[PDB]
Design a protein around this ligand. Structure first.
Ligand SMILES: O=C1Nc2cc(Cl)ccc2Nc2ccccc21
Length: 266
């Protein structure tokens, strides 16, 4: 079929190079094209195949420019579904948190840590299905069933675990668990609890002192707040693991109806 390899760049999606929406000349199929750790990003992306992870279609090199062909998520960023200082309805947040956990379980299972989980990197498709995006900061923490401890400073300060700022070495998995907890906090309260998880940060000190009568915690129901109490634990060895997050009472609380399905009466 001629012209099937031709794509038109029709809109800018993100900055960093840049990301553009590409539409196939023949089929009108929409894909995201990333124009540009790059050799590592392609390498990690080639290992990935999961319904809650942005799909990698392939790459091409035109001289100094690298082109990454990725799944286009028309719903945009989770960040834009969060109303400032409000959040979003608790059942939506629970459904997004379930899909985030499925994606993170998948990645950890193949020994990959994302290292920059935040609502800007959680994209939504046309059915509002969450997809983990951008593996530019991602790394392998388990190879030949041997765990490698990390020491590199990666991420975004409001979402980083406190061990990254306090310890030379740390386990990868509790770091991603912590950022998911900050994502859950943002979805339920529409605000970030602190600039960074350090003792110098009053907001962080208040949380360790259990002053939940203050914001953002006073906007959050006791059931998801009990889960946040288990995730946002300073000691990464005492922090809840994903298998135990899946056993949490709020995580398993019926809240949300399925997608509105067409129906008639009489
Ligand atoms: O797939 C995307 N979908 C998007 C769609 C809209 Cl309408 C806005 C923003 C993104 N977010 C993205 C950011 C980087 C790379 C791709 C996207």
């Amino acid at each position: 079929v001629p012209f099937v390899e031709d794509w038109d760049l029709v809109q800018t999606l993100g900055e960093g190079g840049e990301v553009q929406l590409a539409v196939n000349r023949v089929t009108e199929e929409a894909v995201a094209v990333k124009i540009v750790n790059i050799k590592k990003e392609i390498c990690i992306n080639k290992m990935l195949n999961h319904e809650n992870v942005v799909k990698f279609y392939g790459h091409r090199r035109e001289g100094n420019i690298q082109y990454l062909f990725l799944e286009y998520c028309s719903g945009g960023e989770l960040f834009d579904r969060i109303e400032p200082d409000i959040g979003m309805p608790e059942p939506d947040a629970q459904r997004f948190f379930h899909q985030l956990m499925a994606g993170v379980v998948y990645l950890h299972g193949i020994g990959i840590t994302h290292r920059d989980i935040k609502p800007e990197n959680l994209l939504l498709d046309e059915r509002d299905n969450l997809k983990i995006s951008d593996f530019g900061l991602a790394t392998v923490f388990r190879y030949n069933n041997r765990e490698r401890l990390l020491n590199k400073m990666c991420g975004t300060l409001p979402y980083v675990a406190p061990e990254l700022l306090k310890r030379r070495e740390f386990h990868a998995e509790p770091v991603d668990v912590w950022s998911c907890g900050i994502v859950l906090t943002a979805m339920l309260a529409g605000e970030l609890p602190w600039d960074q998880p350090s003792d110098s940060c009053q907001e962080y000190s208040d949380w360790k002192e259990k002053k939940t009568y203050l914001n953002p915690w006073k906007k959050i129901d006791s059931a998801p707040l009990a889960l946040l109490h288990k995730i946002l634990v300073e000691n990464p060895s005492a922090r809840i693991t994903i298998p135990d997050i899946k056993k949490d009472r709020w995580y398993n609380k019926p809240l949300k109806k399925g997608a509105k399905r067409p129906r008639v009466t009489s």
